[PDB]
Ligand binder design. Structure first.
Ligand SMILES: Cc1cccc(C(N)=O)c1C
Length: 209
């Protein structure tokens, strides 16, 4: 049972701009996804301060980066608050319509694509490096869902029969053929050190056989 949705016109335009604009500094996608994970971790931490049972779904608060060269995927995993099905459909819990408007008003006014996270739409920077993005998420108040999009104006949502995650989100980047540098350990380490060195949760870079 797969539901297919149209992006709002403004979000489709944002994704088109990200995919078609010549812009060499693609590495900032990772900082944006790690920052999103940190924000989601902050949220479940705050909820747990007054209700410790919020962590019954998992006490550990962390971020894992998992490259897989056989699948050509880079996965950013966190044990943050996750998203409900409603959140997923509603632009992954963001105010992406108004954020896009502000972002595109900044671009013609001096800004560049690297400032996308200041407008609350940093998730879509995934499409700098990914031909397809899969988002698997579990929120304490809902079941486990998979969102997916290869851009082109539409996204899908289905219940996820995959490996139960407990609580949190996995962002699976199906990398473009010419972007496989982002699977190499030394490249990922360099980027995390450059742009994510002060994130307040452990970031574990997995290695491959
Ligand atoms: C905005 C967004 C998109 C995809 C995943 C996540 C996350 N890690 O919870 C967020 C905050």
């Amino acid at each position: 049972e797969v539901e297919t949705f149209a992006f709002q016109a403004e979000i489709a335009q944002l994704m088109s701009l990200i995919i078609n604009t010549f812009y060499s500094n693609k590495e900032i996608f990772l900082r944006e996804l790690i920052s999103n994970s940190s924000d989601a971790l902050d949220k479940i931490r705050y909820e747990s301060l007054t209700d410790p049972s919020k962590l019954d779904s998992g006490k550990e608060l962390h971020i894992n980066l998992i490259p897989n060269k056989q699948d050509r995927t880079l996965t950013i995993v966190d044990t943050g608050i996750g998203m409900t099905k409603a959140d997923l459909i509603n632009n992954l819990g963001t105010i992406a319509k108004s954020g896009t408007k502000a972002f595109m008003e900044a671009l013609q006014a001096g800004a560049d694509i690297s400032m996308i996270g200041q407008f609350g739409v940093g998730f879509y920077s995934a499409y700098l490096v990914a031909e397809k993005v899969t988002v698997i998420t579990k929120h304490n108040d809902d079941e486990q869902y998979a969102w997916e999009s290869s851009a082109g104006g539409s996204f899908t949502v289905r219940t996820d029969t995959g490996e139960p995650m407990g609580r949190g989100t996995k962002v699976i980047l199906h990398l473009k053929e010419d972007q496989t540098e982002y699977l190499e350990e030394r490249r990922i380490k360099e980027i995390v050190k450059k742009h994510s060195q002060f994130i307040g949760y452990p970031i574990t870079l997995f290695v491959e056989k």
